[PDB]
Nucleic acid binder design. Structure first.
Lengths: 51, 96, 74
RNA sequence: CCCUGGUGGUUAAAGAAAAGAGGAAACACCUGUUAUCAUUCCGAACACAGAAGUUAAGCUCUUAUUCGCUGAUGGUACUGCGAGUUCGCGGGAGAGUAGGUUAUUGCCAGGG
RNA sequence: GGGUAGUUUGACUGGGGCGGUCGCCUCCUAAAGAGUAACGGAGGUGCGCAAAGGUUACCUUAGAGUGGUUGGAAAUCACUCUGUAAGUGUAAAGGCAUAAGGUAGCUUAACUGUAAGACUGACAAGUCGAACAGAUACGAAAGUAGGUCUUAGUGAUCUGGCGGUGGCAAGUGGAAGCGCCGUCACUUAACGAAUAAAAGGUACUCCGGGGAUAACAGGCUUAUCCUUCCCAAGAGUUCACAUCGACGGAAGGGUUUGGCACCUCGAUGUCGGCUCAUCGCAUCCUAGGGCUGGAGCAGGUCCUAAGGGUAUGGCUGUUCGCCAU
RNA sequence: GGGACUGACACCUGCCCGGUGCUGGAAGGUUAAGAGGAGAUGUUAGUUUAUGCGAAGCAUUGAAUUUAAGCCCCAGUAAACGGCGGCCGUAACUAUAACGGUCCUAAGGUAGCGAAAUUCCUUGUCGGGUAAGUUCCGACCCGCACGAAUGGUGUAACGAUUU
RNA sequence: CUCUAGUCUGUUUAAAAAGGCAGGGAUGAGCUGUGAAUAGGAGUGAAAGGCUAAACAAACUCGGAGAUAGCUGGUUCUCCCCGAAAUGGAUUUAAGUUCAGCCUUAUUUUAGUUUAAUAGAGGUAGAGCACUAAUUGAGCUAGGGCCUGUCAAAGGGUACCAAACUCAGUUAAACUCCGAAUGCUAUUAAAUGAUGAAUAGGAGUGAGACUAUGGGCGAUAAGGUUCAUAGUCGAGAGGGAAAC
RNA sequence: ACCUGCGAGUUAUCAUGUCUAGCAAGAUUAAAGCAUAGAAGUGCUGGAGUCGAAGCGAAAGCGAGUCUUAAAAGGGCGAUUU
RNA sequence: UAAUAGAGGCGAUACCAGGGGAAGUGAACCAUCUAAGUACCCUGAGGAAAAGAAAUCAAAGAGAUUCCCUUAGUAGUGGCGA
RNA sequence: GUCGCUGUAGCUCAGUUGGUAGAGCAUAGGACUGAAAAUCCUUGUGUCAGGAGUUCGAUUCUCCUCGGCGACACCA
């Protein structure tokens, strides 16, 4: 009941990060302030698919 | 029966042979030791003076050793440090 | 009726790596341990797994206070 | 300098309990919640504002060491080595016994 | 689609099979550094958490006693003593009062590029790490944070999928494709993974070897077995020892069932019967005794004694045993 | 005419179509090649200020639609390969259980036979034979683990068979 | 004339399957002569895994072929110097192989090794009950039942069943408030003299055994099995333990 | 069984180390041709090629520096000392 | 039928072309792969056979086929295992 | 990974190219038989799985998901 999600930089769309998240516990759309190395600046990353 | 080292480790990529631009290195120290003023360091003179072999015809000039003699060059590539030193000594450079 | 058990982990090689009075340089590992069997004194640091390491060159020393052992670099 | 308060250093408990002594200054108790501040309720704590009163408690000192803590000297266990054999050389507990113990000290502020 | 063909069908193992086990973590064995085996002794594990992570700030359990609506041994509240015995998602151990325990606010460092120096180590790998640049979170600040108090929650290479980059581009310009960076798909669990793809029989057997390894014997051992002996509560009308001796205790014998695998598998022929024996005495008979709860006859128990003798048949391959004389 | 199994003769040959085979049946579910080219991709005359778009040609592709047998599915077939159960209680002593209840299966062994070329316990128990019979004959049934064409139970005659 | 039950001889036989006593069939599914036909994954088979040129669970000859063996055996003149291992890790591995460990040659390097002194970290032996458990006898006493002015109200006699507590006394690899000896590490000074290390060439070994201590398993049995330290054998002749 | 004979790390190539010989930042020819004589020689000729002389990186590319990244900021591999 | 012309078989336990085509083995099993288009069989010829005068190579400007030297154990290929 | 679909009453099943919320079984009540059965009759049993959009309104129409499906292709 745990899936591998990918955190995507909002303003570039690059899949910068991958992480684990438990489905059937929140089924929300996890957002995380992560550092986007393309821009040398922190920004918002959203949950998304892997494949 | 243990998995050999060349099978535990991964590979890295192609070799890019068949498309290399391969060609001979000649150094400034060599030119200083072998030549003198006023002649054209080029394919013909380096070949006859036995600094390269006439299989390759795309010489590059590198900057080991020091060069003191004003010369003319007709070469295919040149390093930035070497052409700076050679222009400073007062030679001339034509890229062919 | 065979044996119900027989199972052991790999030995982890804990213990004191540099003896008191030895000369170490910066970054040396002094103790490997689970938990602060030895606590941190002057000029040493504690890793995330309670490893003791030397922040500067010097000589290891162990002191005892209220029954607890402290490691320092002097 | 000494007292008081603050802050360290050296580790053996520098531990609690009961009794007695004081309080100029200092510390604390204590007073009000009104302002900013705090509690999963409570100005108890925290926080702010102060000087009516007191050693009562905390604190310091003095006590029978009352509990704890510490603890020899010998002897034993154990032990390395040994052509001496329950022996030869060296190392030497724990427990118990005789005791001991209610810290010491550096520099800052106040006034003696 | 066994009509036919090519093959596979693991290893450890006090012989093999059957059973069990195979990776990783914690403790003991482990003989006070590290390491150290067995089919030795106890357990866990193929995760969980968007907080149960990061930081700031503030608090302290469990137990016993005591006073209390139901309330009882034990719920919640208050005090005293005790001082971590409580609690730390999850086994155990090492730690944890400055708490790593409990609560609340904010928050995403569960970051990019790196990394002096090390630990552990056949190798492959694994582990710790100050500090530096970018950019955040918390904090007044100093500072801390590169997931979780620590140590288990894992899987090489090849192949392929997805996103990015734009390096390679078979005359040139593109492109297919590949490389690079990010990343996904293996109870490959027999968990350093012989293939993308695999079960049995042979007493019809064959070959190469082994006493490296079993069955028959020898050897070591004596649990078991057999023969005694020590203690004597008792039974025996009373009377421990005429006789039996329970409950325990100490040995020998090497015969029984076993243990070990030391000799022998380029061969040590295996059970009974027949024939022929020889030796031991722990004596079945004959011989000599002591005591009897020995009147006599006939016995019971013990000691000495191996010279000689120690039946014919029925059943069963039987040794053995039962039965008839 | 071929194959399978049984094996003169006499009396008989019981129950089960779930499993696996064989036979028959297509209503569906599923399914290959072949047709079908939605659409996507590379190239570029041109357009686009240019990228981007990009007609035609040439290539790489592919879905929706269509489609057989087979499998799933619906029946039959055991002289097809095969299968044919447990527990508990109960009568004018004691014993057993004609009987009853219950769980499960496709169905739970009928006739006959039974310490057998089958029976471990076992040299079962009783009777006959022998002075004495682990063999033999006749029975009992508590059939470890008989059983009806892998035939069941008998049988005159026959046997370099066994007792 | 054809076959071979029973038995004996034979068994380095007269015979690479016969001989002597005998036995079965003998008007038939009979015996036999001379030709012919069916061939190796095939034939034939009144069915034994029988037979197909004395060998058949897949004939013989030649060729691939000097097939492949982690298995067994063998490997030839001399002398000088040094000299192992039978362990660790991994393995379709356990009788194999590979890396490390141990050996040798060449070059370079100089710092092993044992003491003594000083200073460090353990938790073993031993000991102890302060923790986790086990446990002996008294003292005390909740609680449980027994008995009694009994209803089952509040009760009382307590032989006991007994928590906690007190005194005295024991047990533990997975208990530790304590705790050595040796061993381990660092430095220095002496003592010993190439025993250390680095690079490169070549290996072998990866079946061990017993003895003296500490253990685990077994039955404080085994010349048993499995580990740790040291020795010897292994690879060691000589003297002693009668041989060994 | 005895005795006597026969009977087992060899050859061709490549890799690498050592020794010897020669040259030297250079070393060296292979196939093949001519001359000579008939004498499967040995003398010239033959530079095609091979190994060194520069490395780093998957590669482009840049080079005593290069790769990793904005960073020689620090490291990995180099080196200036052949 | 007639007329001529040429074939038949052998040799060479060699060489060549075409057709058919293994396995013992190695991969420490094995099935892809390897051995290998090898062994062998069959049909054809020759003194040689075959191939051969570009609808070729390949990024160089060369100019038929064949045989040596090198490229080179390189480019690639392979349960990217051997 | 993909294709064909479904989820509506306690169960099963309709559901109309969009204006119904029901059919059968069962549940409960009345009646019937001597009861158990079988009629016969009443009677409940819904965001029609959730959301967005289409319509004037949506179980229905489309799309995105949730959970469960049947079937197909890969599986180092």
């Amino acid at each position: 009941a745990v899936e591998l999600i990918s955190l995507i930089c909002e303003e570039t769309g690059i899949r910068n990060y991958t992480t684990t998240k438990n489905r059937r516990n929140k089924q929300e759309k996890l957002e995380l302030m992560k550092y986007c190395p393309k821009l040398r600046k922190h920004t918002l990353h959203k949950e998304g698919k892997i494949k | 029966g243990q998995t050999p080292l060349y099978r535990r480790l991964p590979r890295k990529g192609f070799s890019n042979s068949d498309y290399k631009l391969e060609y001979a290195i000649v150094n400034l120290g060599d030119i200083d030791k072998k030549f003198k003023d006023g002649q054209v360091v080029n394919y013909d003179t380096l070949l006859e003076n036995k600094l390269i072999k006439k299989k390759n015809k795309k010489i590059k000039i590198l900057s080991n050793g020091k060069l003191t003699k004003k010369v003319s060059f007709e070469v295919s590539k040149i390093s930035k440090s070497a052409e700076s030193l050679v222009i400073k000594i007062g030679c001339t450079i034509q890229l062919v | 009726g065979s044996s119900k058990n027989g199972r052991d982990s790999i030995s982890k090689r804990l213990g004191v790596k540099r003896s008191g009075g030895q000369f170490v340089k910066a970054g040396e590992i002094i103790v490997r341990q689970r938990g602060t069997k030895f606590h941190k004194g002057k000029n040493v640091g504690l890793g995330r797994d309670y490893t003791i390491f030397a922040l500067s060159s010097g000589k290891v020393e162990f002191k005892t206070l209220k029954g607890r052992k402290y490691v320092s670099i002097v």
